Specification:
TIM Barrel; binds gadolinium ion; homodimer; alpha/beta; binds chloride ion; six-stranded parallel β-sheet
Chain lengths: 328, 316
């Protein structure tokens, strides 16, 4: 019914303009607590995230989905502190990303299902903060362990109504292999977002998934290493396609009649330790607008290309609310 | 020169009989906090650890070294609670084991040095508990990343005087690889224990390391599950070569484990019900029956660990 946030449950009407694929910090389990000075200090990270989220709020953002899992270093007390000080809703996540420690990757599908249910139904750690989404990541061809994760995600979603968001690393696609596993578990496509789908220009691929009822996450819009060709780490992380090319996939799916299947986001963050040192400075140099990039740059761009305001409000308000509202 | 424990600094005279390579829990960073029910509950893990440490204390143990690193799920607040309840000193560790997350394995040698120094000089997380040892694990062939870890460990040891303990996973030898890297950095062998050394029968290899000044960690004795007596006889063999001062003995035990198959703890407990008391209850009497004097046993279990753990920036 209602949606669980790091400040507690909110009604669908309170969700508002939502960014569906974000993070406060991209890290590893326990790392922010063990080496906060990697980020300058915990206090500096909080300050930067609060300033950044307040800017996004000024630009109209009301809710973000922090898809950070246990193994991406999710620190729900950090999310709570930042959500409260920025006065922006944050939905927390369960699931498994691409760096599970042994205590996770040795677990069975039944064990993973119980872990996800604990975080959704009881709370994360000892905080009582409950997850409102399940995040899964796969590599190219689904590994045996990643199939266990996808199946446990489907089983937790069916038990709680909470949605699933995915992405594929190092491959421009992946959604068709994921969708096959999800449907083999009886999961409705309307509970699944195929994330980072703006990494490809394969419109046939995107349209076919949308036509099955999947949500299409065009959610890395500002990521572009154009101009940073001499930084190989930036190219591998952000790609060589312009943000306008990513944004025009939004227009293309609208033009095909699938406005209701689109979710949009920046895939931003305010600190990152899981990649090369000081990569946050590289991303900040490419997109000083941070999480405000979507409302400030992409929305007017799509308006200039003729998309009605009503259609954009449906994509940024109505679709995420339908997605996040628990449904089974 | 005092030794840092999870309850603060203690003097050498308080260290007593020490188990130099142990764990309370073998896990992953953040896992005990995120899924305590995997262990039944946090309270159940505490109660089991306290009973196990009280049993070891009644067999004479006064200090354990918990060599669990960040990536093995070290929870220093758990260690502190168990140490207080059982009245057994616990020395905590920094370093890197075999499962570093991206935030660790993307780091440079200079960054890893700073991380170890933070945990030794300032404290672990926000607790003020300082590490008293650096643990490094490697695999058969040292990987490029493992070499960075070994060099960072040497640099942190040289800056603080705390010792380093290492082992090689998947090869009965391998100490030569670490020794060459450590010496290239200027680290004294007297600051280094080559652990899991009871996993080889090649006594010539252990003797050659002992002759270079390394400490020999005969610390997986009950993991035979090869008999434990044959492993324990390596202790007598090294004594008879004249290297009693270079021997450290332990169990490499723990009271919960999540980093392998589910219920592996039950397998472990079935083969060694003595837990951490295996060394004092089985190995020490066995060596005494084989004619090792009391004074030599006390040297190995009291004098050697205190010499090893006492921060020493300059070797004799
Ligand atoms: Cl992610
Ligand atoms: Cl270890
Ligand atoms: Gd061990």
């Amino acid at each position: 019914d209602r949606i669980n946030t790091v400040r507690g449950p909110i009604t669908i009407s309170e969700v508002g303009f939502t960014l569906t694929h974000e993070h406060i910090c991209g890290s590893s389990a326990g790392f922010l607590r063990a080496w906060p000075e990697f980020f300058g200090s915990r206090e500096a990270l909080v300050e930067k995230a609060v300033r950044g989220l307040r800017r996004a709020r000024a630009a109209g953002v009301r809710t973000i989905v922090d898809v950070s899992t246990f193994d991406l270093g999710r620190d729900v007390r950090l999310l709570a502190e930042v959500s409260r000080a920025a006065d922006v809703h944050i939905v927390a996540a369960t699931g498994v990303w691409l760096d599970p420690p042994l205590s996770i990757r040795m677990r069975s599908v039944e064990e993973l299902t119980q872990f996800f249910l604990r975080e959704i139904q009881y709370g994360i750690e000892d905080t009582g903060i409950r997850a409102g989404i399940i995040k899964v990541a796969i590599t190219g061809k689904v590994t045996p362990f990643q199939e266990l994760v996808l199946r446990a995600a489907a089983r937790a979603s069916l038990a709680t109504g909470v949605p699933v968001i995915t992405h594929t690393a190092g491959s421009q696609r992946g959604g068709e292999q994921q969708a096959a596993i999800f449907e083999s578990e009886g999961l409705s496509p309307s509970r699944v977002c195929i994330g980072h789908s703006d990494e490809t220009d394969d419109l046939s691929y995107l349209t076919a998934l949308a036509a099955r009822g999947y949500l299409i996450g065009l959610d890395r819009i500002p990521h572009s290493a154009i101009g940073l060709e001499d930084n190989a780490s930036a190219t591998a992380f952000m790609g060589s396609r312009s943000w306008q090319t990513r944004a025009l996939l939004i227009k293309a799916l609208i033009d095909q009649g699938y406005m209701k299947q689109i979710l949009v986001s920046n895939d931003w963050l305010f600190g990152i330790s899981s990649y090369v040192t000081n990569f946050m400075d590289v991303m900040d140099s490419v997109n000083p607008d941070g999480m405000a990039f979507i409302p400030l740059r992409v929305i007017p761009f799509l308006r200039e290309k003729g998309i009605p305001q009503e259609t954009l409000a449906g994509i940024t308000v109505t679709n995420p609310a339908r997605f996040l509202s628990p449904t089974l």
